[PDB]
Design a protein around this nucleic acid. Structure first.
Ligand SMILES: Nc1ncnc2c1ncn2[C@@H]1O[C@H](CSCC[C@H](N)C(=O)O)[C@@H](O)[C@H]1O
Lengths: 38, 70, 22, 50, 235
RNA sequence: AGUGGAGCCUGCGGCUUAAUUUGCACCCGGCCCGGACACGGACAGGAUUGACAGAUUGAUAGC
């Protein structure tokens, strides 16, 4: 995937898809008020 | 505190390196600062400078020419 | 008389899945 | 770490030689007796701005 | 350009304007959002059903927010059509068809807090000849100061068209007895420029000498890092 | 006439990231080579050069 290797089974229903779909190259994005006292 | 009259004065040391030769209860020879009884144009309210300590000059101690006893 | 106490007297992931893919 | 001594006191430092003689290395006065004085070891890391 | 510049607030906010007001999706969102910041900025007693005064309720948008928070309130409005559609929305708090500049008719020390969302910028423009902007603002602020329990904060969200507007509002408030300031949340941000008037009711010597000699016009050594530096200790 | 409202696209911030380059530059892995001078070591008992085949490797290769 650019950095590491991901191991995958080859299932019979995996027939129509590329190999690169099964190793995602990016990680998902996972992303206190003033009150005056005087 | 001066010996011959018991008066207290505040005396100047040429740098902080020379002050390490001075300890409490050392006999010190003191002169005036240099403008004839007037204080310093830089340090407010000091008129005296240390000349000798333990019968050796601060110039001889600061230049390694002589050592002082204790 | 003082005492000679110099010190204190008081005492779910598949096998081949990488950590990235996980 | 040393027993309390009230100043003034003179400070002689000696290093023991192999032949048994003590060689004099220092000279001075006992400044103070307090553990509140802290020593600060400093480490400098160096980097190259490539 | 501005709703305020149109003219008399009542004549501007007619039945047509009122219908379009509640139909506007932005109006709903921005007003509830501003009322949230208003109730937060004013430091109401925490975990306490408060008694606020809606100086500019209009459609009862800010009012409905206070009802949801459990804070009972009284509305005040110059637009009859807007108050009709506010009572058609069935808001919990009571309403009253009156003028802010004229004066709030409540016992001194009755409301613990006051919510005013976009309504005080209309008092700085004399729509009639008798209308006096300074006097109208002052009278309103003085009445509010008294009506409000001495100590409770009266948050006042405003939309100034210039500095003169803000200047007038602030002077007429500070001289009426209102103390505090103004919290401009997100001041640089323009779409979030929210002005809330929170108003509670209770070697250098050698350098100078060388410049002296330079102005006198004689030859002066060039100024370097060795200008004033002690050469040595002196014995 | 609009924009500021809504959906989409894009530019600066910010957030995630190995990198999301910057006022193919970025990231993850694998090759190639990198002084003489002085002094002290090993060196014809042998210093050192080239090499088939197999393998490691994402792949092959006396690198
Ligand atoms: N002098 C005055 N006296 C009373 N109400 C006034 C006034 N000048 C303006 N207003 C009111 O200011 C309002 C502007 S809109 C206020 C409603 C608020 N934005 C909300 O929806 O929560 C109008 O409803 C108008 O009646």
């Amino acid at each position: 995937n650019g950095k590491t290797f991901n191991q995958v089974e080859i299932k019979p229903e995996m027939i129509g898809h590329y190999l690169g779909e099964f190793s995602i190259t990016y990680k998902p994005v996972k992303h206190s008020r003033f009150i005056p006292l005087k | 505190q001066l010996i011959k009259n018991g008066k207290k004065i505040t005396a100047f040391v040429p740098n902080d390196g020379c002050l390490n030769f001075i300890e409490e209860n050392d006999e010190v020879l003191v002169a005036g600062f240099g403008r004839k009884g007037h204080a310093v144009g830089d340090i407010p309210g000091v008129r005296f400078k240390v000349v000798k300590v333990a019968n050796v000059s601060l110039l001889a101690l600061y230049k390694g020419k002589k050592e002082r006893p204790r | 008389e003082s005492l000679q106490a110099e010190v204190i007297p008081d005492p779910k992931v598949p096998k081949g899945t990488s950590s990235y893919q996980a | 770490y040393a027993p309390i001594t009230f100043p003034p006191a003179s400070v002689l430092l000696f290093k023991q030689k192999s032949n048994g003689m003590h060689s004099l290395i220092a000279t001075g006065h006992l400044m103070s007796v307090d553990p509140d004085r802290m020593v600060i070891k400093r480490v400098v890391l160096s980097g190259h701005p490539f | 350009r501005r709703p305020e510049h149109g003219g008399p607030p009542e004549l501007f906010y007619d039945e047509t304007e009122a219908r379009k007001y509640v139909r506007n999706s932005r109006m709903i969102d921005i007003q509830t959002r501003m009322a949230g910041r208003a109730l937060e900025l004013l430091y109401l007693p925490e975990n306490k059903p408060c008694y606020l005064l809606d100086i500019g309720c209009g459609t009862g948008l800010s009012g409905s927010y206070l009802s949801d928070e459990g804070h009972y309130w009284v509305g005040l409005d110059i637009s009859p059509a807007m108050l009709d559609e506010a009572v058609d929305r069935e808001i919990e708090g009571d309403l009253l068809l009156g003028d802010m500049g004229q004066g709030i008719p409540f016992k001194p020390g009755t409301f613990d807090g006051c919510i005013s969302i976009s309504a005080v910028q209309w008092l700085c423009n004399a729509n009639k000849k008798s209308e006096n902007p300074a006097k109208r603002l002052y009278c309103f602020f003085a009445s509010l100061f008294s009506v409000l329990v001495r100590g409770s904060r009266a948050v006042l969200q405003l939309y100034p068209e210039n500095s003169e507007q803000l200047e007038l509002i602030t002077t007429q408030a500070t001289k009426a007895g209102f103390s505090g300031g103004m919290v401009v949340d997100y001041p640089n941000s323009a779409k979030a420029k929210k002005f809330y008037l929170c108003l509670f009711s209770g070697r250098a010597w050698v350098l100078e000498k060388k410049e002296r000699h330079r102005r006198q016009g004689r030859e002066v050594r060039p100024d370097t890092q060795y200008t004033g530096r002690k050469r040595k200790p002196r014995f």
